[PDB]
Structures are given as structure tokens and as C-alpha cells.
């Protein structure tokens, strides 16, 4: 899922160790990870869109 992108990302992070060119590149990957982790918990938190007209 999102984890496919991220599995390649972190494999690449520990590869990115082996490049000293990074400065803020790892911070950009870290940021994409942050908000990616935010959207999944957002999506898991999700209320049913509308109030139950049956019960509620």
C-alpha cells in the first residue's frame, strides 16, 4: 500500500547513508514520511460520513 513506497524509501534511507551529498534531502524524505503517517491515522480515525438516521 503506502508501505510499498515507504519500504523502498527506508531501504533508500540506509542507502542514502552511503551518499554524503544529502543535506536536507533526508529531511525531505522524513517530511513525506511524517505526513504519510498522518494521513493513514487520519483515514483510520475516520467517522462514518453522516449521522445514523436509523438509530441516532
Amino acid at each position: 500500500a503506502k508501505s510499498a513506497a515507504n519500504k523502498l524509501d527506508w531501504a533508500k534511507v540506509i542507502s542514502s547513508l552511503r551518499i554524503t551529498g544529502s543535506t536536507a534531502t533526508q529531511l525531505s524524505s522524513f517530511k513525506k514520511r511524517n505526513d504519510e503517517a498522518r494521513r493513514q491515522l487520519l483515514e483510520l480515525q475516520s467517522q462514518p460520513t453522516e449521522v445514523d438516521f436509523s438509530h441516532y
Binding site: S16, I19, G21, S22, T23, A24, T25, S28, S29, K31, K32
Partner: protein, 85 residues
């Protein structure tokens, strides 16, 4: 935000390390190397290149040309004794 472009810009790792300098030396040097030398000089048959071949080789430290060359000067002045006497 999008990943930055540092990893893919390599053109200052082409002088960036010290063996680049050594590389540009030995891509010329070893490429222009011959399998064996041009020639060492040992003989050429000028009839005294033969003197060098027998006596003045790379490995001949043997005292024989010295002895011979010494004896030559002994032969020279000894005759000159009889030129003056």
C-alpha cells in the same frame, strides 16, 4: 516537499577525491608504457660497443675493463720510453 537533487549531481566527485589526479597521470603513463623497454644499450657493434657488451654490462662490476684499460696506458708510455731512450 519534494526530495532535493544533490545525489544525482556528480561532476565534483571527478576532481573531488585525490586519486582523480593520480588517474589522469597513469591513464597517460600506463597506456604509453611499452611491454619491455626500447633498448638498454649494451652493444651496437661499433667494435667498442662490444667492449661495453663484454665489460660494461648492467650486471658487470667485474674489474676486467679497468685492468685492460690500465694495461693500455702501460703499453702506451712504455713504448714512449723507447721513443725517448
Amino acid at each position: 516537499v519534494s526530495t532535493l537533487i544533490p545525489p544525482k549531481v556528480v561532476s565534483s566527485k571527478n576532481i573531488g577525491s585525490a586519486p582523480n589526479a593520480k588517474r589522469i597521470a597513469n591513464v597517460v603513463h600506463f597506456y604509453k608504457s611499452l611491454p619491455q623497454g626500447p633498448a638498454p644499450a649494451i652493444k651496437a657493434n661499433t667494435r667498442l660497443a662490444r667492449y661495453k657488451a663484454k665489460y660494461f654490462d648492467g650486471d658487470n662490476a667485474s674489474g676486467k675493463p679497468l685492468w685492460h684499460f690500465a694495461l693500455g696506458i702501460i703499453a702506451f708510455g712504455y713504448s714512449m720510453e723507447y721513443y725517448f731512450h
